[PDB]
Design a binder for this molecule. Structure first.
Ligand SMILES: Cc1cc2nc3c(=O)[nH]c(=O)nc-3n(C[C@H](O)[C@H](O)[C@H](O)COP(=O)(O)OP(=O)(O)OC[C@H]3O[C@@H](n4cnc5c(N)ncnc54)[C@H](O)[C@@H]3O)c2cc1C
Ligand SMILES: Cc1cc2nc3c(=O)[nH]c(=O)nc-3n(C[C@H](O)[C@H](O)[C@H](O)COP(=O)(O)OP(=O)(O)OC[C@H]3O[C@@H](n4cnc5c(N)ncnc54)[C@H](O)[C@@H]3O)c2cc1C
Ligand SMILES: Cc1cc2nc3c(=O)[nH]c(=O)nc-3n(C[C@H](O)[C@H](O)[C@H](O)COP(=O)(O)OP(=O)(O)OC[C@H]3O[C@@H](n4cnc5c(N)ncnc54)[C@H](O)[C@@H]3O)c2cc1C
Lengths: 575, 576, 90, 90
């Protein structure tokens, strides 16, 4: 079709929030994604939701790695001086293999990467959806903190519903409670610990249905039996390239796409254009469309439109280690048990007294330990083989201004090993907040292009001196101190800062504020691009503040608010 | 789910899809079970590399393969970690941990062997090479009449090739492909012939190849449907097939016991015909879990009741691998027909050729692509266009070089990524040796240890046989070193090496075919029917009883087609 | 020698080293010169190399010498993993 | 020529590496981007640690090194003393 009420670029969780809202409200919606349906019969669903992946969670790191394509790889300068004399040998470090010659390797976010599949990165994410407290969060209401808090509560509540956020899906994990209780005790009165809030529904003791874009909106074309009055079409393998501005710069007139299967290019018309292509690619599509400044920043000629586009970018510092559980904590697991005799032998019985007030642990815990120690008497640990992973956090606070995850999950790194029993291993990830600075930028080459023939992204980024840097190092030390209470570092996973941007929490590339000039921003609190009646941006690129927590829930909340504007200001076509 | 089908197939890989395609088409009521799930988009069982993104970022596809390959038998780990904090819990022994197999001798393993549980099986990830076996590598379907035998294999392979859409033309306009092909052709001339690797694939565009898969064989859609209103097929993903039930006389299978992994329910499914296409390892597992062969560590003093050759005479290929960096001479040859004046990057620079000159070394299409690359990309120091498709060259197995060869680029489990050398220069070398079948080389199943699906844990007892297998394997290494030198020197970091045993994933002979159970030490006859059993058939590389170097799937498909011929001759489809 | 990072898994009695040494044609353009600004640890002009193996005979032989080591070494044994055939740093 | 080295011959490599000082090390351009943000961090690949900025890393003899001990490299060498045939000889 040539004409829609709304077109949405990208099928990640944020595009899906606009689809859920606007498709539900009766709009003829088209959604385009440059990537394809892979994921199974549930379009855009979490790839970790297969029996095989949940039996072999360490293999999922491979899936993640296989769909994270680096944003900007500087030109390689490794010296290979052991080629055969007959082999063709370089005289210079020329531009090879997709590298970016615009990129200073020392001012990069080398770990930054993007995913191009239907459902975006929600096909592989780790589902942590905390709310930001005031300190981390931009204002949606000026001069009324209580009204501002109320608005965010209303939006986050809906967002949590859409993602199926919960804080009890790991409540009966031994490892989770083990870690939770010890940290709760150690910081008693000083910090609070809880389960990471997770966009997930537990289906069985050994299976968790992790949420994804599909959870937000199932991405099935409509009308269909289950929604005969709704109108939605998803078009995968369509690279969206430009929004066409009118000469007056007050309205978008079309979206120019490239159908990657036929190879043909089309102009799609809509009343309302929503860009939810991610924090990098939203900015890319805007710059390729005449917003901001194409090429190396040049203050001499400021751009015509959106001069803050691609400036004030933030990415979080991330420190990481893994620990091996202390003897003391492992011994405490079986503290309630009565242990008759010698394991393997007839004289082995393991029993406990349900409800005994002297017991350190609940009955659900002892029953599982007992059963494990009795079913597996050769095994030297008291933790059940199927015990779900820990999922503990102490949330960002002024006296510890970083987000924390004390957990086990699959990421692009954490290349786990086989010599140490996995039941012993806990991951530590602390996330710092980065002050937004005009000098930190994502820009796009006016000569170099990427694999889809669009302007090559280039970072110019350093963690700002002052608070960001002081905090990041204070965060490291906090991780070293806190993790030492649970066990010592796992060799091969010693405490370290991760490559800039590997954390994938980039924000502020197309930031939100109330006033374009005063707040140095690109979209207002309805996520509308300043000056344009019908152009909206969604995603973490909107977030203008220094945040430690995981941003997606916050980007979703902004999107819900955006949709309220859209619904108030545009009327659906007749069906 | 019904209680009753005409045919049930275990496994939705390309071999199971061969039985589905034949049997569904002939009007049988078919059910197919796979323990894994739908994972390749809307085209069920399709090749996961058929995305625009993967074909633009082909190095990334290694991670997909690695993510779905689950190792078969991992010996207990004895790595010393002695720098734990004194507070951390520490083992006193190297105990059974993290899924490891205490049965497995680490020194007599196929440590690289791995399986994939996804609908479409390993054909969601494979490299699509589908050569025929020559007589030397191939089991006999007709004894004492080599022309009847040749005629039967030709008919079956031709059919197999249509199902896979095998061809040898998809890479014909690649400059790198032709550069290597013509060089090796000239250098060997009259000693070895070279051609494109036969590939199960159809090119869609200059930048995209639709790799074939199980889906290409059979689309895996439930039937009847608008397209196939008179066919009957249901696929049931996430169902672990556990045992076939023998009647008391051991002359028939009475049902298949399944475990639906989502609901946890268990059922006994009844069919006229039972087909096991669960792969070389898992077919054997299922059969042993059903009282065929011998459960547990082999014990010759307790000879099995049934199928004594089951899981013996296993073969797996020796694999040697390197990469090379293209010679300066060959790179200069790419631009042999060009006239180049001025200095690159200046407006006086030009690159031209004489179209049609019979003294041109290359054809016009080549020279135009070089011209355009050099004129539009004057900062680039190489003459090869950026999106030039990869080489896909082979000289097939012959008695004077008894190994298969691939001189190509592809995504495999071990395709480690380097960025210092331009990828246009890099060619992969994979030479694959044939392994003599020997009784002592075994896949067996623990009577104590179980796998992730609570089935008997697979254990290998394998070494490459002394004598011809070993001699060839090493002569194969040398051949790779000699041939490859003609194209370029090795790429540091990919020096010539034997790969981990079983990484190549060409295991055969676990349930091997022969004419006579005893005399040929085998488990199925040439209809792929299990000896003694009217209605049990095995399909897959497990059937192949010979020493082969070439990639085995086409051959197993051809056997599967023959097997279906017997089925159609002996079982009537139920009326619609 | 300076290279050879020790291994213990394979019995040393089995291990044999192969070192083949090529001859390099003398070319005027292959140079050792000394900086007029940078100095070394004893305050003398810093040595600098400008060197490549000459194309032509020197390169062709070096690669044929590689192939010859692979061919000859195979008569004695296969390569030790971790000491696979390689050109050493110039 | 110590009983200890000839009983532990793999350890002699370390003696060799210990006295071979590289002749020309080009300026280092390894990217270390996981420093703490509070650590002093370079804006350029400047001349560090004895490196030679005259040296093109791609036209070097990077393995060339010298020994500054009495007896020179003969304190470490492998003692192979073949004659040159005519072809190799001035
Ligand atoms: C391993 C991993 C772990 C993470 N875990 C956490 C976590 O626990 N919590 C947290 O909040 N976040 C986490 N994240 C980040 C989270 O996934 C993102 O913040 C979120 O997915 C962003 O949603 P989005 O819809 O804005 O964009 P994306 O999910 O990036 O999706 C946008 C999409 O647009 C498409 N697209 C891009 N360019 C174009 C174009 N030009 N034309 C058409 N389509 C286009 C894509 O193909 C893609 O599907 C994780 C990410 C990964 C990779
Ligand atoms: C990276 C890669 C490259 C390869 N390249 C080539 C090549 O170029 N040429 C070629 O000839 N071969 C190659 N192969 C090997 C080829 O993929 C296999 O030979 C082929 O897939 C075997 O087909 P099959 O149907 O017998 O088995 P599989 O493809 O292994 O399918 C068997 C299936 O049965 C299932 N299953 C297993 N156990 C059970 C059970 N108990 N219950 C129910 N279902 C079960 C699985 O989940 C699976 O889908 C390669 C393989 C890989 C992974
Ligand atoms: C591990 C090893 C293996 C080798 N194996 C072989 C082999 O088996 N066969 C063989 O032919 N070659 C071998 N060599 C090379 C051989 O060692 C040299 O060719 C030989 O030592 C050169 O002798 P020379 O006296 O000219 O120089 P050197 O041995 O280099 O001695 C020169 C000396 O002069 C000194 N010097 C340098 N500058 C000054 C200065 N400005 N003022 C005062 N003194 C100065 C030194 O400190 C030094 O002792 C080997 C070398 C090494 C290190």
């Amino acid at each position: 079709d040539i004409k829609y009420d709304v077109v949405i670029v990208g099928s990640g969780p944020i595009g899906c929030t606009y689809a859920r809202e606007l498709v539900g409200a009766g709009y003829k919606v088209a959604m385009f994604d440059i990537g394809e349906i892979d994921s199974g019969l549930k379009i855009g669903a979490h790839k970790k939701n297969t029996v095989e992946y949940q039996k072999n969670i360490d293999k999922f790191v491979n899936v993640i790695q296989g769909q994270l394509m680096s944003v900007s790889v500087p030109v390689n300068t490794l010296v290979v001086d052991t080629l055969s004399p007959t082999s063709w040998q370089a005289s210079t470090f020329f531009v090879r293999n997709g590298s970016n010659p615009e990129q200073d390797p020392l001012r990069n976010l080398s770990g930054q990467a993007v995913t191009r599949v239907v459902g975006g990165m929600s096909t592989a994410w780790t589902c942590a959806t905390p709310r930001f407290d005031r300190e981390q969060r931009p204002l949606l209401v000026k001069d009324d903190a209580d009204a501002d808090d109320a608005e965010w509560d209303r939006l986050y509540t809906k967002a949590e519903s859409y993602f199926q956020t919960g804080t009890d899906q790991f409540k009966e994990s031994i490892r989770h409670n083990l870690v939770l209780n010890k940290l709760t005790e150690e910081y008693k009165g000083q910090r609070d610990f809880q389960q990471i809030p997770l966009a997930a529904t537990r289906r069985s003791p050994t299976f968790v249905e992790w949420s994804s874009a599909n959870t937000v909106f199932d991405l099935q074309n409509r009308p269909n039996t289950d929604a005969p009055e709704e109108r939605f079409n998803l078009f995968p393998a369509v690279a969206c390239e430009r929004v066409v501005r009118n000469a007056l710069n007050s309205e978008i007139e079309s979206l120019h796409i490239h159908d990657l299967i036929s190879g043909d290019r089309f102009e799609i018309k809509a009343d309302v254009y929503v860009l939810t292509a991610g924090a990098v690619h939203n900015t890319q599509l805007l710059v390729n469309s005449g917003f901001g400044q194409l090429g190396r920043p040049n203050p001499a000629n400021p751009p015509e439109l959106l001069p803050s586009l691609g400036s004030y970018i933030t990415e979080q510092s991330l420190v990481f280690c893994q620990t091996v559980m202390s003897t003391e904590l492992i011994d405490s697991v079986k503290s309630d048990m009565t242990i008759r005799g010698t394991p393997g032998e007839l004289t082995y019985s393991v029993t406990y007294t349900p409800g005994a007030s002297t017991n350190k642990h609940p009955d659900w815990w002892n029953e599982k330990v007992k059963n494990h120690m009795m079913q597996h008497q050769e095994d030297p640990l008291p933790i059940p083989f199927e015990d779900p992973e820990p999922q503990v956090t102490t949330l960002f606070q002024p006296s510890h201004p970083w987000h924390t995850q004390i957990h086990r999950d699959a990421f692009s790194y954490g290349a786990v090993q086989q010599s140490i029993d996995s039941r012993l291993i806990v991951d530590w990830r602390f996330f710092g907040r980065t002050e937004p600075k005009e000098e930190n930028k994502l820009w796009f080459s006016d000569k170099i292009t990427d694999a889809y023939n669009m302007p090559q992204p280039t970072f110019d980024f350093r963690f700002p001196a002052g608070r960001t840097s002081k905090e990041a190092e204070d965060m490291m030390t906090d991780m070293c101190v806190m993790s030492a209470k649970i066990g010592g570092f796992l060799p091969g996973s010693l405490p370290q800062f991760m490559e800039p941007g590997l954390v994938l929490h980039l924000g502020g590339t197309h930031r939100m504020g109330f006033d374009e000039k005063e707040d140095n921003c690109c979209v207002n609190t309805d996520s509308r691009v300043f000056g344009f009646k019908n152009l909206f941006l969604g995603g973490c690129g909107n977030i203008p503040t220094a945040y430690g927590a995981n941003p997606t829930l916050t980007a979703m909340s902004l999107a819900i608010k955006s949709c309220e504007y859209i619904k108030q200001n545009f009327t659906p076509s007749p069906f």
